[PDB]
Design a protein around this ligand. Structure first.
Ligand SMILES: [Fe+3]
Ligand SMILES: [Fe+3]
Ligand SMILES: [Fe+3]
Ligand SMILES: [Fe+3]
Lengths: 125, 125, 124, 125
């Protein structure tokens, strides 16, 4: 009974996609988004709420949470749902220092379609 | 008396700095960071824990939280403080649909130096 | 100012701070929005979070104690207000304090902006 | 494997413990804590950062996040680690409405001992 669903991100729009933008000299930038190939809805009633990034350096006994991004605006206003003109898209950039290569894991949440995860390898050298 | 401290970011390394990077297809990309000009420490004992971004479109009576970024790694491990080699930089990028100009406000928190605020204008026309 | 501190005629948004206990520095604080008169909780209108800050009397800086997010507002694949799961905007923060001082709570309504409440923590 | 470690909370104090305080007239209150019977340390260098509660109603294909509590103070101050006098206990109370019984899952995080989970049944009637 696994809560964190996984799939091919080219076929399933809910999967968080991890992209290593740079990993030069211990300086790391990692972009994570939901709906890269197929866009996910972002309305007052249906949206991605957050992405969390976890990094486990090779040989490390435990993983470390790198950070978490909340996407809080989804068009709600006093004029009703989907009227504010403000919608936060589910994409986040995490910049961090690291001394070793390791494993990246991302988790994301859709308010109606449950929890999701994805993985990538971080190579420094 | 205010909880939220403000200052010249050229002199003070705590003020969150707001940078509007791009605006295409109805989406705006806003980078927020602490320590852009003068790096704030990131140790187990002393670090920026999060940044939160708020946007109030012109003509809107209320502001909207766009999002929040937590910076969760600060070097802690079973081997002691500042030993994990993983340190999350206090920088975030928020992408959000916006249709109007208005005011951006960013809040940030240092675990020992209290709460901070920065402001900028989003100009769409 | 972004942080509103006074309620309207019919709608209460100001976070209410209650010190449940405080013996020997072992402290429990309940923060709520709309405990007497409920604030709406729908997909379209809800309190999203409460954050509690504490500044001990001698401290130059305040500390965040904690933050509670209220994440369920009834949305499901069957549509809004069909999940039957709705998180009330109430939190209990338990913490150690060695000194008296000032409590500040912040909260956010997704359509009614940002709010601030204040109370004193007295240990003796 | 899985990033979320589990165990008998009586033997492993990292495991989040779910206590259903009430579950009567649609009205549910649930206490979740780490270190219920055996306290987990709370120091600047080593502490529980957050707990997240998840609920999946019987017959619901997807789980829902009920809420998330962050425990942000760990004694840090301008005078050094473990000097502030302010430490947030990793205990949270989630009050929520439910229409059906189901499965509660809690997630928690220790800054040095990785990610943890616990489970409990919610019976309404
Ligand atoms: Fe979805
Ligand atoms: Fe600082
Ligand atoms: Fe409201
Ligand atoms: Fe631990």
């Amino acid at each position: 009974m696994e809560l964190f669903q996984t799939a091919d991100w080219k076929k399933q729009k809910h999967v968080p996609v991890i992209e290593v933008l740079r990993a030069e000299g211990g300086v790391v930038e990692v972009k994570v988004s939901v709906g890269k190939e197929i866009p996910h809805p972002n309305t007052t009633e249906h949206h991605i709420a957050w992405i969390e990034l976890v990094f486990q350096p090779e040989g490390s006994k435990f993983p470390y949470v790198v950070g978490r991004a909340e996407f809080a605006a989804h068009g709600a206003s006093v004029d009703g749902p989907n009227t504010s003109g403000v919608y936060t898209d589910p994409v986040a950039v995490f910049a961090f220092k690291a001394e070793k290569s390791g494993k990246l894991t991302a988790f994301s949440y859709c308010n109606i379609h449950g929890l999701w995860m994805g993985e990538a390898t971080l190579s420094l050298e």
